[PDB]
Amino acid sequence: VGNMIKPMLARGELRLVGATTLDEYRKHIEKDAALERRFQQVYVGEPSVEDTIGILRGLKDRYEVHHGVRITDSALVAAATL
Amino acid sequence: QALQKYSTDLTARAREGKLDPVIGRDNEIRRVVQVLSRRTKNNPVLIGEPGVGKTAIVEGLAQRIVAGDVPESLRDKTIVALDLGSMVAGSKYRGEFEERLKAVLDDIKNSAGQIITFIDELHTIVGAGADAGNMIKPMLARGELRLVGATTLDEYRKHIEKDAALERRFQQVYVGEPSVEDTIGILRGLKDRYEVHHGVRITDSALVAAATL
Amino acid sequence: QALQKYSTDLTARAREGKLDPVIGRDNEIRRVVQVLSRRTKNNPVLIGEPGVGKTAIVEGLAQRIVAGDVPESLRDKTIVALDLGSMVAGSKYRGEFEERLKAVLDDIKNSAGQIITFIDELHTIVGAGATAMDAGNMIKPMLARGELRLVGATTLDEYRKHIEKDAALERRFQQVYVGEPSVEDTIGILRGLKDRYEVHHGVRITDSALVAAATLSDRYITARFLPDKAIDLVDEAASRLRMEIDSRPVEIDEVERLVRRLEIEEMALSKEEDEASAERLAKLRSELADQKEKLAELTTRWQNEKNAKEEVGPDDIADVVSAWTGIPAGRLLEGETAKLLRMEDELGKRVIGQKAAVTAVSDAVRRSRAGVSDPNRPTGAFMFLGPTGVGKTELAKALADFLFDDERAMVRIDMSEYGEKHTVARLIGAPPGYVGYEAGGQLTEAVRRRPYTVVLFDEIEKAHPDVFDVLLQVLDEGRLTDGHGRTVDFRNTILILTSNLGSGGSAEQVLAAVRATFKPEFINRLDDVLIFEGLNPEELVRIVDIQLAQLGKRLAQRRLQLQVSLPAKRWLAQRGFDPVYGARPLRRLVQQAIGDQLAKMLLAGQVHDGDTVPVNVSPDADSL
Amino acid sequence: KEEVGPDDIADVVSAWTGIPAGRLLEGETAKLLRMEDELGKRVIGQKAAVTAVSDAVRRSRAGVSDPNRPTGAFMFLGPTGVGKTELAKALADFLFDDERAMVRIDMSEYGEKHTVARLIGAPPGYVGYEAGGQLTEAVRRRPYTVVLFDEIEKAHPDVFDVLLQVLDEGRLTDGHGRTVDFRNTILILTSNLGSGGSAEQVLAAVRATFKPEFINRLDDVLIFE
Ligand SMILES: Nc1ncnc2c1ncn2[C@@H]1O[C@H](COP(=O)(O)OP(=O)(O)OP(O)(O)=S)[C@@H](O)[C@H]1O
Ligand SMILES: Nc1ncnc2c1ncn2[C@@H]1O[C@H](COP(=O)(O)OP(=O)(O)OP(O)(O)=S)[C@@H](O)[C@H]1O
Ligand SMILES: Nc1ncnc2c1ncn2[C@@H]1O[C@H](COP(=O)(O)OP(=O)(O)OP(O)(O)=S)[C@@H](O)[C@H]1O
Ligand SMILES: Nc1ncnc2c1ncn2[C@@H]1O[C@H](COP(=O)(O)OP(=O)(O)OP(O)(O)=S)[C@@H](O)[C@H]1O
């Protein structure tokens, strides 16, 4: 999105959870939609350096068995900042 | 078996109690009835800025029919929720949407004049062409189907008024937005549905403050 | 036999008499006949605006064939109506459409000139079956030799959108322009048609209704054409009347529904374990009782009239034209004539003084309901001017309030922004082929909907002296034309042009400044150029009363109210000084002297919701 | 204490649109009472003005103010370098804690007639039409800002005929024909009339420069010491 899911949706039997980008959503769901009255926006901008560092250090063991070499917090933070 | 896979039954839906209890707006229901009960060219079209309840009037008419509060020549008519999103959708050939549209029209006009029809957002009626949404006029301007509609001001002006010879077959019912007092009335009417859905309670002062803010 | 499978019949329907009778239109049918009976290229195509009758002519021709009033060479021809829809039902294969078309064509040809085909809306014949043009012109050879006759009727703004583009085919068609009839002929059409409706609905119809409908449908509904927008009014009136011979008439069913609503509401609002419901329920009881009284009174009057309304009259038409295109055009049914005779002292509640202007506005509104006004000219075009803070904008808003009950239902344009000439396109739309064109005009597409609103022109003298020239037609008659060329109607909207010319010179110097800031032919359009006058210290006391009423009504949201003593009430007006700034200083004084202290107390405790506070004067200020 | 209340709705309608509409929940009242002094830490001097703006905010949020008119239309003027723009910025920093969340426009640029189109837009059929107007776009969202008019003495007396109805109604109409509401903003417009003269030599400059229809619109004309 077209006109084939709105008669299904304004009845209360299905629940769709979608996803897209900001400007794209502003394109296909604003001009030709007339449906935006039944869609609720949720914003997820971007994590920060400190947050993606936690993400990395959470997701480290999986690769330490995939390849398996060694990991250093210095390497993680360097990757993040660089 | 023609209008069985391209339509539902809004009347039977209201009989199953799964509709919302419209409150007020008796002027517009009476206007819609005294238009839908005409002799020729009986097709009302609910017009008004978006959000003010242009479908709620049609559900109200359905509930009133089910309850039996309508004039003599309006009982047991079983208004039908037609749809075109599922007729023009799967068709990749020459002249295939036409067979479906003609089957629907034929099934309507075989039965007596008791299949009052309802297309919502009928600004999706001028397309389907490529000579579509245009073979319907000979049955429109003769009182064969009733075709209760609902469209926004903008879409109406942009999509229909460019096709004047079709706009003639319609009647406008300007559904203006309600005032604060009528809004409080409607809110107080609907309170119980949400009070049941969410296991909480809602105060009348809260309703008034909502309708005022 | 393929005909009997891909087409209906018309002469049969005529013989069994299912076609509405046809009246008038003699020259058109004669021309159609003499074209339909020529040697080569005998194809009439009825053209003209939508609604004026382009199929009724063909059905009249069918009736005339059944009767026998046609010339010799048109005897017993059995007109047939094709159907290009059911000819393309299933043709997903390659030739399943050309086969059917050839079948129908050779079947027409094997009939020795008997059949006279009739394709309704023949502008759909162009793209019969495509993929590169192959179909829809298979009848182009047979047309020329006059094998088939092919009478058809299509609208006027599509004959140059689809067919005229293909002038190889259009050449084989003769056009029969069909103009719209006048009121004198519409009256006859109705007088002849005034049986089918009178029968379908079990009612009777009076000729006064026919005449009044044929007049109002031309005066007011300026969007459709005459033979149809007139019949619609009669039909809806009869439908409503039949719906009233049902159990109960209107104006009582609505009141009983409203009473039941207020009952079901007061019943469920009573069990409120709350305090904010005390003063909200005390009025609902009053309203329920005072509507049930009217219910009982209407009931008793109906029983009287029933113990001591069977056909439509020339006023139910007015009620329909009022319910649709909400212009009110009834006959002043005694429910509001008191209101109209009271209009002066009813507007005096929001404006104090300026009885001269209130009288002019009241007269121009009154003498239009009684049908004495100029039928093609706006309902009045006033420009009232004077010093500032006097009440001109307030009077305009008060008039819109009294008329509509909703101040937010008038059209207000600030002519202080139109300082540049080119900004006039903001209210007239941009020509075709430019940026903003699909949205049309703004003032125009505001008036075209609900053409009963009030129009208002703030600060007319600030605009460039070329915006003034767009309003000449608007004031002379009710016509303005946006980009799309269409024309809106201003015949029944009350124009108002506020201003500030000649601040305080004299009651005559300003009548020499206006004539120097305008043109000689612009002043000539307006009605009386009302001149406001400043305020007197005796007149500001009532203004103080009004401001205090406003402040109390706004405070009643926190269930407070005040008790003002006459010392302070006259002190405030005694501080309505400097007869140069009108009456706004009084508003700023009320603020500065009451609101600040009231808020200071209110948000510092000690003034908890409920209890009223009395204001009492002091030597210089006033304390609470 | 397991049911919705008539202030949770205000909580929602303030949780979006930014408007602080409510019934003076706790802490907020302490801040409002503690305003004249809390604003003094950034604006030393000018005792007369801070009280006026503070009373305006107090009235507007306490529940006694005309719902259809701006929340104040002050124009304060005085000698050079006294703290006018700085008072405005300190206010905006007080009730937002974001110095860059107000909409200031420099009236020093609009010495030309036609440059007004930046805060209105262009009529239908001209170059910049679908973009809108700068001021109108900035105010249609964030309907709680603090509009400012830096040194409104330069723009020759035609821009005074848009504020003439921005004030007293909070109305403005951009190119597309829309309408915006200024009903809950605080318009503030400085100046430099006077320049040394007494209060009765600058109150003549105001009269001889502007019009009665204008001076009558805006609120108290604060003079700075
Ligand atoms: N008179 C009424 N009685 C009861 N519920 C109403 C009434 N008017 C409006 N509503 C409710 O308000 C909402 C309006 O939704 P709809 O009327 O279905 O939307 P709509 O009027 O079709 O506008 P669009 O064009 O579809 S976005 C629904 O939740 C209705 O239940
Ligand atoms: N001369 C006439 N005598 C009687 N009734 C007429 C006459 N002219 C028009 N009418 C009626 O006025 C209405 C006009 O209907 P039509 O002529 O069928 O519409 P139309 O002219 O075909 O316009 P379109 O574009 O096809 S919708 C019908 O109710 C006709 O019965
Ligand atoms: N006769 C009056 N009756 C009641 N209130 C009045 C009257 N005259 C003035 N007022 C008050 O003064 C306010 C300002 O008057 P307005 O008419 O709005 O100003 P104006 O007449 O438009 O003058 P200009 O030229 O536009 S500044 C009104 O909103 C009222 O509150
Ligand atoms: N009472 C005061 N409190 C705090 N800073 C002040 C005060 N008076 C002056 N200042 C400082 O004076 C400087 C100039 O203040 P501004 O308000 O920016 O100048 P201005 O008032 O705009 O004068 P013009 O006419 O625009 S040049 C800033 O650095 C302020 O911090």
Number of H helices, E strands in chain B: 9, 7
In a domain, B181, yes or no: no
CA dist., res. C161 & res. D121, Å (int): 36
CA dist., res. D56 & res. D72, Å (int): 7
D80 CA distance to ligand 4 middle (Å): 8
Number of H helices, E strands in chain C: 25, 16
Asked if B130 and B24 touch (Cβ cutoff 8 Å), the reply is no
C154 is in an annotated binding site: no
Look-up of token digits 């008796």: B26
Phi-psi region of C225 (alpha: psi -120 to 50; beta: other; left: phi over 0): beta
For ligand 2, pick from C189, C197, C217, C234 the residue to mutate: most ligand atoms within 8 Å of CB.
C189
Asked if C354 and C536 touch (Cβ cutoff 8 Å), the reply is no
- C615: three-class secondary structure by DSSP: strand
CA dist., res. D144 & res. D92, Å (int): 10
**H-type alpha helices, B37-179:** 56-67, 97-110, 137-140, 153-159, 164-167
C612 vs C275, C278, C556, D23, CA distance in Å?
17, 17, 10, 19
Asked if C415 and C459 touch (Cβ cutoff 8 Å), the reply is yes
Q: Hey, are the CB atoms on C422 and D126 less than 8 Å from each other?
A: yes
Query: CA C573: distance to chain centroid?
Result: 45
Test the B interface: residue of C92, C244, C322 with most B CBs within 10 Å: C92
C51 is in an annotated binding site: yes
CA dist., res. B46 & res. B32, Å (int): 9
Non-local (6+) Cβ contacts of C90 within 8 A are B95, B96, B99, C96
Q: Hey, are the CB atoms on D9 and B208 less than 8 Å from each other?
A: no
Integer-rounded Cα Rg, in Å, for chain D is: 19
Using a CB-CB cut-off of 8 Å, the residues of chain A touching B51 are 37
B137 is in an annotated binding site: no
Residue D59 to chain B, least CA–CA distance (Å): 18
Q: Which CATH number belongs to the domain containing residue C301 in this structure?
A: 3.40.50.300
CA dist., res. C371 & res. C379, Å (int): 11
In a domain, B192, yes or no: no
Identify the CA nearest to D191 among candidates D165, D224, D162.
D224
B100 CA distance to ligand 3 middle (Å): 65
- A9: three-class secondary structure by DSSP: helix
**Number of C-beta neighbours around residue D111 at 10 A:** 11
Nearest CA to ligand 2 atom 21: C53
Asked if A1 and B85 touch (Cβ cutoff 8 Å), the reply is no
Non-local (6+) Cβ contacts of B213 within 8 A are D9, D10, D13, D21
Experimental method used, please?
cryo-EM
C227 is in an annotated binding site: no
What are the DSSP E strand ranges found in D41-147? 73-74, 104-106
* Residue B29: domain span: 7-174
D→B interface, C-beta within 8 Å: 2-10, 13, 21
Q: Dig out the tokens for A5 from the structure.
A: 């899911």
Residue D90 to chain C, least CA–CA distance (Å): 22
Q: Hey, are the CB atoms on C388 and D58 less than 8 Å from each other?
A: no
Neighbours of chain D (3+ CB pairs under 8 A): B, C
Nearest CA to ligand 1 atom 10: B53
Q: Dig out the tokens for C280 from the structure.
A: 């909200």
Q: Supply the DSSP symbol for B58.
A: H
Nearest CA to ligand 4 atom 1: D44
Q: Give me the residue from B34, B137, B188 closest to C240, CB to CB.
A: B34
Resolution in A: 3.7
Size of interface A-B (CB pairs under 8 A): 19
C390 is in an annotated binding site: yes
Asked if D175 and D129 touch (Cβ cutoff 8 Å), the reply is yes
Closest Cα in chain C to D178: C442
D145 vs C452, C513, D92, D101, D182, CA distance in Å?
37, 41, 8, 7, 9
Total number of domains in chain B: 1
For residue D180, which phi and psi values (nearest 5 degrees)? -120, 160
Residue B15 to chain C, least CA–CA distance (Å): 22
For ligand 3, pick from C361, C388, C393 the residue to mutate: most ligand atoms within 8 Å of CB.
C393
